[PDB]
Design an enzyme around this catalytic site. Structure first.
Site, PDB file in Angstrom:
ATOM      1  N   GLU A   1       0.798  -1.223   0.000  1.00 14.47           N
ATOM      2  CA  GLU A   1       0.000   0.000   0.000  1.00 14.47           C
ATOM      3  C   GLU A   1       0.839   1.285   0.000  1.00 14.47           C
ATOM      4  OE1 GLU A   1      -0.693  -2.698   1.929  1.00 14.47           O
ATOM      5  OE2 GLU A   1      -2.633  -3.225   1.052  1.00 14.47           O
TER       6      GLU A   1
ATOM      7  N   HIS B   1     -11.427  -5.196   9.352  1.00 10.57           N
ATOM      8  CA  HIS B   1     -12.331  -5.072   8.217  1.00 10.57           C
ATOM      9  C   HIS B   1     -13.414  -4.033   8.454  1.00 10.57           C
ATOM     10  CE1 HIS B   1     -11.850  -8.945   5.538  1.00 10.57           C
ATOM     11  NE2 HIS B   1     -10.768  -8.181   5.561  1.00 10.57           N
TER      12      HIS B   1
HETATM   13  C1  LIG Z   1      -1.971  -4.748   4.381  1.00  3.38           C
HETATM   14  C2  LIG Z   1      -3.005  -5.675   3.731  1.00  3.38           C
HETATM   15  N1  LIG Z   1      -3.441  -5.421   2.471  1.00  3.38           N
HETATM   16  C3  LIG Z   1      -4.340  -6.213   1.850  1.00  3.38           C
HETATM   17  C4  LIG Z   1      -4.919  -7.290   2.520  1.00  3.38           C
HETATM   18  C5  LIG Z   1      -5.995  -8.126   1.789  1.00  3.38           C
HETATM   19  N2  LIG Z   1      -5.530  -9.527   1.574  1.00  3.38           N
HETATM   20  C6  LIG Z   1      -4.784  -9.919   0.475  1.00  3.38           C
HETATM   21  C7  LIG Z   1      -4.438  -8.902  -0.591  1.00  3.38           C
HETATM   22  C8  LIG Z   1      -4.444 -11.289   0.477  1.00  3.38           C
HETATM   23  C9  LIG Z   1      -3.618 -12.065  -0.519  1.00  3.38           C
HETATM   24  C10 LIG Z   1      -2.358 -12.585   0.196  1.00  3.38           C
HETATM   25  O1  LIG Z   1      -1.601 -13.324  -0.763  1.00  3.38           O
HETATM   26  P1  LIG Z   1      -0.369 -14.199  -0.342  1.00  3.38           P
HETATM   27  O2  LIG Z   1       0.324 -14.644  -1.579  1.00  3.38           O
HETATM   28  O3  LIG Z   1       0.389 -13.458   0.689  1.00  3.38           O
HETATM   29  O4  LIG Z   1      -1.015 -15.429   0.438  1.00  3.38           O
HETATM   30  P2  LIG Z   1      -2.027 -16.625  -0.056  1.00  3.38           P
HETATM   31  O5  LIG Z   1      -1.669 -16.905  -1.510  1.00  3.38           O
HETATM   32  O6  LIG Z   1      -1.796 -17.825   0.766  1.00  3.38           O
HETATM   33  O7  LIG Z   1      -3.458 -16.074   0.079  1.00  3.38           O
HETATM   34  S1  LIG Z   1      -5.136 -12.026   1.862  1.00  3.38           S
HETATM   35  C11 LIG Z   1      -5.849 -10.551   2.376  1.00  3.38           C
HETATM   36  O8  LIG Z   1      -6.495 -10.476   3.423  1.00  3.38           O
HETATM   37  C12 LIG Z   1      -4.447  -7.513   3.837  1.00  3.38           C
HETATM   38  N3  LIG Z   1      -4.897  -8.498   4.646  1.00  3.38           N
HETATM   39  N4  LIG Z   1      -3.496  -6.701   4.395  1.00  3.38           N
END
Ligand SMILES: Cc1ncc(Cn2c(C)c(CCOP(=O)(O)OP(=O)(O)O)sc2=O)c(N)n1
Ligand SMILES: Cc1ncc(Cn2c(C)c(CCOP(=O)(O)OP(=O)(O)O)sc2=O)c(N)n1
Ligand SMILES: [K+]
Ligand SMILES: [K+]
Ligand SMILES: [K+]
Ligand SMILES: [K+]
Ligand SMILES: [Mn+2]
Ligand SMILES: [Mn+2]
Lengths: 332, 371, 371, 332
Positions: D66, D136
């Site tokens: 972000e 959230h």
């Molecule tokens: C700071 C921030 N921005 C955006 C999110 C929204 N978010 C996002 C964008 C996710 C994707 C994470 O991808 P990853 O590759 O780290 O993990 P997985 O592939 O296992 O979901 S999970 C989620 O809650 C968040 N939790 N925190």
């Protein structure tokens, strides 16, 4: 310029911070101090001598990355060790805002008290300095006041700084301690060499008075002390002068008791008026002290602009701005 | 001949840009093939039967729990859920290589570490339902697990925040002596956050005993890795920070175990960080692959598989039913633990809610809340 | 054979951690030795005499200005100052390789880019003194320069913030067509900020025509690079993000020029980022080295050096004296440009100051402020 | 659940945001939309169809970072192109706080208007959603209200969202537009298909009244509309209901005019009480309307805690909390 505990020594405010940090690392084997440029003593000398005395594992430089400094300090504190982080200017605390607001403040609540970072303290130089302009002058306390779970504490002098910083370090909640930088090498005063504490969430009435209450914190306390003197000499008006000390949780009771007596309140701070912490004090006093208010509560604050370089003399809520507001309020 | 403090290098007299090698990236370490066969005997960890059955049972119990809670979420019985599909082997395999007291930080794909650490099914359920048994007091979204007993630091939603925090906990562990590692899990999407660059650099310069375990499944929500980064995944970033790094097959519980074992051994001996990037699929599965290995050794068969599938479903359903019929915690708990001590002004807000409920309580769902 | 979306790689059947190569890092590109001699003729850019004299005169005029303003700061005539010592060649050499309209972002060591772009001495002075001629209206600390005409984006104190911003400006340039690059300068300390990881990754995934120019002088304030990072400087980070990277001798104006020329050419043709890490000393100097080259070619001598030293001192002192005797801007300017349009409540604060000064103006330094 | 312009179509609030974004990219060739997961339409569907219609260079995903999203958007805007960034939940805007507060807000001032990022708009889902818990559900507007140089705007409905978002996009200052997520798929209303603007820094009196002024924004506007109805039916009390719409710069005059008429004010918001924006409104109205105040100004806000999961029904300043406060104020 716009402005009982054992043996003491004259100390200025940078020296009092060193003394607090030394007393901390002497009595708490877990404690460490870290941040940018702290090892050689820091850019305002607050950590001079401490790495030689306590060791490189205990007083050490981090990379230049404030979100990392705070997240790293939270991690130390999760293990129970005392973590005293420095942010080099309060203007540069914003990269760490998510780690402070979303993580440190919420750590204990969100875990059901299974984990915490109570042993974290973040200390940072704060407030105007005559020529700091936009990024050497800021006073960010109102941004943090809206975040339950952190404490925000600001001293007005060397004696107050050491006792309030030791209280932050030992308090079991994450604390931000803002050190007014324009006082680092201003006048000394006597400061106990051994440790002592000043309570958090406790204001101090430093001069009693009957006509008006004046509230400020940091260097601005000295400004309102001088306004009190101007008001007595020029207007025959008796002012009660209060240093708030802790921004959150703040001492609502001491301020309201004063205003029930005087019927008038003037709050002053260098930070901008809009959203500044004077709004919280004003709205609260108005709720608790409504029937006692003889005049509207006055806020004399920095203007709603970024903090300017060459215009600083015209920007700050100086003693004449505070005095003129006080004069109008007395005449309301 | 160059005398610059910032780097150690020779001169070169021809202009040559350094090209990233992404087509032929860091290879993927694998111990067993898709048929569960050991490929290179010198790499076989020869884990004993009881330990390998524990890896298999922890993965499959996690999978059984995911099926049931995912359905519960589809019905609105719980408000949110994250599954572990495709991540059962990265988490059980790495957890098995840790000491029980090594501290874990993670995000939303780490429930298998808790399951290997014998976290009760009742407590996973309690957190998802926010009921009176939840030690988190019902305050966080489902799947935001934590356990102090089992050294698993409470999950928070903001991604990557736990990365620099894990490094601070590892620095503190180094100072405390006592020979513990910290492991920190995160996905490849989270590695794009600024806090990952912070954690990675601090761990190297401050010489911290930490394992960074990145799971890379090619996607973060809808975002494929082509839009997430352009280098050779996450493993290739480690060496730029001075961090020893490896990439492993996340569908191979033994490759994950071996890499984590060796990273733990060296991190704690040397006080230096290690990065493991385990490649997985966003869901040839870790459970199927280990089942084939078990068969070969004569350690499992279709009858045992049937009985365990039945028994695991029974244990999860027992926990599920109990969790749904527990009350939620007392509403007074929304005010505690904001600070260690409740500030008087916060107590005043608590008293205000109590007075409010005395007069208007018929309008609040008071009946499934404690006291 | 591996089929993982996140990386392109083969399998490996033996556990091998990847070791960073830091002792033998990325070599340092050099065109002329310390005696000003061309080392490898195929790398000589053969810049014409008038251009090379401009490189030399811009560096030395910058150095003359630094000496005078540094003394002014020691006397409290201005409140703050940052010198360019050791950085005159990285900045003049790279600026010379850019098109005049390529957009520059930087921090506190980039005044030589403005000087190459013929920024008037009066305007450098005006900003440091915050006088009526400053187009920044006296609002920022000294040395926070900016010039819209010369495409040099205003400096801000928070480090590394300009890095992701430069990448956005380069994305917008790509969309606009018109074949412009953005260059973004920062020190090795600033590269530790989260915003550098943000900028570096975005430029690669969004395919931006940007040159990242990192100056590495081994120190950030008191912090040596051993406490700043543990990889092979900053250049070694570029390939992990998929960024073509090079390291150059920052005391060699021709090595800097060549690397920047070629990075510009390829960034604008290919819409891909380039990273240059120029090694410098925290202050064998760029000015001395170019002076030796000039002598060889017969393009300078001791008499010209004497006359230019005299002339440059005269031009800087003329500007200095004029800047000190200009008034500061009208105090009303502290209220404009907070928003494009002054909000009525902000106008009310301006009116409040005007009334205040009418009554209490004797207490304010009104006499060297305009109107 | 706790709660003239040409052709129109029924739209819910997510659809109205798409419509505004579509109208923007149709009429402004420079405009781009970017952030996490926007290309496939976004996690709340606000960008559905736009990449297919306008092109992958114009509606595109960024890495998951972000602070990078906002710094990149500032950079686009420095060149004069319209940059519409998304932050996926307002709870995750904090990593970008330094880029918003230290850079975007101060860009124009600090350069003497030589550079600016006026063509930046940051849009983000906001506010409680029944079960969002700590990360959230947040409503961060008071953190931004203390930062001169940004505008902060929050709509209450689909019609209001599209006209206020188009105003943010076209306004020559960096704007944060907070979209109340619990309304994304709540009731539709008629929304003009072609572009229209609603002014910034202008409150709306949506129901006139003579006894008390109620002020809120976002979903809480619907709560205070219902409180007005309860107050009329149960107490015979006439309430003037005002949607503030823009948090800064805010419409001081409309609020003060209302309170000079009624003599009473109640302000409500989901964000925590301490440091929340109700304090700024309260303290300002108290200064401008002191002699008219029949009772203390009341703030009915979220408690000073992080936003809880299972306790949400007891945390929010619902219509009964607002009604009870109103009842006490009427009886003061
Ligand atoms: C700071 C921030 N921005 C955006 C999110 C929204 N978010 C996002 C964008 C996710 C994707 C994470 O991808 P990853 O590759 O780290 O993990 P997985 O592939 O296992 O979901 S999970 C989620 O809650 C968040 N939790 N925190
Ligand atoms: C966010 C932030 N933190 C800290 C500082 C303080 N600071 C610091 C820590 C500097 C050292 C920068 O080191 P560098 O390697 O980037 O550049 P130089 O070596 O040319 O000074 S310059 C300076 O003002 C800052 N400006 N901004
Ligand atoms: K503390
Ligand atoms: K997290
Ligand atoms: K900057
Ligand atoms: K805008
Ligand atoms: Mn992923
Ligand atoms: Mn440096």
């Amino acid at each position: 310029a716009h402005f009982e505990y054992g043996q003491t020594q004259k100390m200025n405010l940078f020296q009092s911070v060193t003394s607090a940090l030394d007393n901390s690392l002497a009595k708490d084997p877990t404690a460490v101090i870290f941040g940018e440029d702290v090892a050689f003593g820091g850019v305002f000398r607050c950590t001079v001598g401490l790495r030689d005395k306590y060791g490189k594992d205990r007083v050490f430089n981090t990379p230049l990355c404030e979100q990392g400094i705070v997240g790293f300090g939270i991690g130390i504190a999760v293990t129970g060790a005392t973590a005293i982080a420095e942010i080099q200017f309060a203007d540069y605390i914003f990269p760490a805002f998510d780690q402070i607001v979303n993580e440190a403040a919420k750590y204990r609540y969100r875990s059901g008290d299974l984990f915490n970072c109570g042993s974290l303290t973040i200390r940072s130089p704060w407030g105007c300095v005559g020529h700091g302009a936009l990024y050497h002058s800021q006073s960010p306390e109102a941004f943090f006041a809206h975040c339950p779970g952190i404490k925000v504490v600001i001293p007005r002098s060397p004696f107050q700084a050491k006792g309030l910083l030791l209280s932050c370090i030992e308090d079991k909640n994450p604390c931000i301690f803002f050190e007014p930088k324009i006082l680092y090498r201003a006048a000394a005063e006597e400061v106990p060499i051994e440790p002592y504490n000043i309570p958090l969430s406790q204001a101090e009435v430093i001069q009693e008075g009957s006509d008006v209450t004046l509230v400020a914190w940091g260097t601005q306390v000295h400004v309102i002390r001088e306004v009190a003197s101007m008001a007595k000499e020029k207007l025959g008006v008796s002012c009660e002068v209060i240093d708030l000390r802790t921004i959150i949780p703040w001492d609502v009771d001491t301020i309201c008791k004063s205003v029930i007596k005087t019927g008038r309140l003037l709050i002053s701070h260098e930070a901008p008026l809009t959203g500044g912490f004077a709004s919280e004090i004003s709205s609260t006093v108005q709720e608790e002290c409504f029937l006692n208010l003889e005049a509207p509560i006055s806020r004399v604050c920095g203007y709603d602009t970024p903090f300017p370089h060459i215009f600083e003399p015209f920007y700050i809520p100086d003693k004449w701005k505070c005095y003129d507001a006080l004069r109008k309020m007395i005449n309301y | 001949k160059p005398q610059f403090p910032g780097a150690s290098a020779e001169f070169i007299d021809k202009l040559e840009f350094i090209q990233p090698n992404v087509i032929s990236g860091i290879p993927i370490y694998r111990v067993m093939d898709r048929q569960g066969q050991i490929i290179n005997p010198s790499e076989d960890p020869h884990l004993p039967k009881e330990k390998v059955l524990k890896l298999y049972k922890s993965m499959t119990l996690l999978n059984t729990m995911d099926r049931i809670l995912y359905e519960s979420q589809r019905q609105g019985r719980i408000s949110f859920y994250m599954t572990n599909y495709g991540e059962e082997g990265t988490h059980v395999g790495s957890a098995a290589a840790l000491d029980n007291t090594d501290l874990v930080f993670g995000q939303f794909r780490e429930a298998g570490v808790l399951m290997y650490r014998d976290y009760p099914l009742e407590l996973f359920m309690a957190q998802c339902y926010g009921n009176i048994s939840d030690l988190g007091k019902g305050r966080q979204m489902p799947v935001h697990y934590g356990c102090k007993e089992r050294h698993f630091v409470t999950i928070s939603s903001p991604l990557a925040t736990q990365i620099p925090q894990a490094v601070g906990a590892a620095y503190a562990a180094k100072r405390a002596n006592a020979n513990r590692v910290v492991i920190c899990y995160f996905g490849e999407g989270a590695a794009s956050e600024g806090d990952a660059h912070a954690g990675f650099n601090f761990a190297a310069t401050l010489e911290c005993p930490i394992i960074f375990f990145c799971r890379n499944n090619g996607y973060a929500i809808s975002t494929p890795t082509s839009e997430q980064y352009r280098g050779d995944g996450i493993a290739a970033r480690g060496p730029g920070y001075g961090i020893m790094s490896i990439r492993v097959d996340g569908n191979d519980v033994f490759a994950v175990y071996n890499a984590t074992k060796e990273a733990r051994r060296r991190a704690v001996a040397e006080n230096q960080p290690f990065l493991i990037e385990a490649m997985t699929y966003r869901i040839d599965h870790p459970i199927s692959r280990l089942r084939h290995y078990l068969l070969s050794q004569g350690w499992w068969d279709e009858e045992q598989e049937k009985a365990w599938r039945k028994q695991s479903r029974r244990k999860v359903m027992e926990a599920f039913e109990q969790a749904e019929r527990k009350p939620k915690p007392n509403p007074n708990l929304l005010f505690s633990d904001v600070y260690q001590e409740m500030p008087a002004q916060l107590r005043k807000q608590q008293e205000s809610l109590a007075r409010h409920l005395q007069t208007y309580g018929e309008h609040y769902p008071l009946d499934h809340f404690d006291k």
